[PDB]
Design a protein around this nucleic acid. Structure first.
Ligand code: MN
Ligand code: MN
Lengths: 209, 206
DNA sequence: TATGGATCCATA
DNA sequence: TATG
DNA sequence: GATCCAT
């Protein structure tokens, strides 16, 4: 899989330029989002393009999550204090990791969005809430680009559609990443939908795993 | 329907307390949200409570919209300039209306929310863009409270679930109102459902 | 009465 | 179409 | 948007 579109707020730009931990975080993310391949035996991600919305979205995220968790030690389901403790209403953040160098601690919150475009709004708002409350130092959202989305489940989050809203993160360190497949071909099998598209293995939860 | 819950930002509070036009607008939207009744032959709204998530949601906003449009002259599906003209990406807001008292103009934008709770985030953000871009002077969202939502299609917007995010509108004139039915009872009807998404009636080729 | 999806619908 |  | 699904 490969990164094609991207928006980085001025605050995130600053971090990326002068902070080694953030640079590291960003690189781990980038490598992970580029790792998904299809089919399982391929070196690149070729999406079946027989028709509009022909592919499921779940199997697409597995390799990226696996690398983040197993190779880079990122955790899943990190509850935000303001939601879990304070307002006691709201779910956790998708992916999370604490980077450390001596006395410096950098907490990065991330969301791999393949849900409906409206869900991307909730994901952005939750990360924004965490950022505004000083719980994370950087927020990231990964999502397919419009071209790729065309062959995935209808209405799935896509870079272009959420783009008009990136400006609501102004004043905060935020990175939006849009990925695309390397090839489009009807020769590869369809990414399964529903039950058949799952497995998703035992994940590394922050509560611990 | 009846208004059971409500959150009014401090900016909206000032408008409501001081501005006549905003008061009129607020008044109009409230009568409108109270409007929807069920069944048709009734003067109140009674939700069928036979089972959790047993009622569809589509018919619920009809009367609300009717009043606003016909009786109050609100405009449906108003496209915001930032989205339609500037960004050329994104759809319109549910209802909009300009209140005029010569020299003074107040534009109010509103979103009736019965879509999935995630969709409420898109609605709130769109109203936020409008506000931020000075296209509206007040934003309002209408949505069922959890108690009522319990008998509507699963995961539809409910006041309590969007509540933890109300703070993202700090500094903007925003009003969030949660409506509820007058009664939960036996009935001749049950609000019908569409074949959307995972409904057993939807076509799934897989 | 929790909560983030995943998948399909209607109408431009 | 693209968008709620 | 509107219906359900997996935890
Ligand atoms: Mn709308
Ligand atoms: Mn609406």
């Amino acid at each position: 899989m490969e990164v094609e579109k991207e928006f980085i707020t001025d605050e995130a730009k600053e971090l990326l330029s002068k902070d080694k931990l953030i640079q590291q975080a960003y690189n781990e993310v980038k490598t992970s989002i580029c790792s998904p391949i299809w089919p399982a035996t391929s070196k690149t991600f070729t999406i079946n393009n027989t028709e509009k919305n022909c592919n499921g979205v779940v199997p697409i995220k597995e390799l990226c999550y696996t690398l983040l968790e197993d190779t880079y030690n990122w955790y899943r389901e990190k509850p935000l204090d303001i939601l879990k403790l304070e307002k006691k209403k709201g779910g956790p953040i998708d992916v999370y990791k604490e980077f450390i160098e001596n006395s410096e601690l950098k907490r990065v919150g991330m969301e791999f969005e393949t849900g409906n475009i409206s869900s991307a709004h909730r994901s952005m708002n939750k990360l924004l809430l965490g950022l505004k409350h000083g719980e994370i130092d950087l927020a990231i959202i990964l999502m397919p680009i419009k071209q790729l989305a065309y062959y995935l489940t209808d209405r799935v989050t896509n870079f272009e559609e959420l783009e008009p809203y990136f400006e609501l993160t102004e004043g905060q360190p935020f990175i939006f990443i849009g990925f695309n497949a390397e090839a489009y071909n009807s020769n590869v099998p369809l990414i399964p939908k529903g039950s058949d598209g799952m497995s998703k293995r035992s994940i590394k939860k922050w509560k611990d795993k």
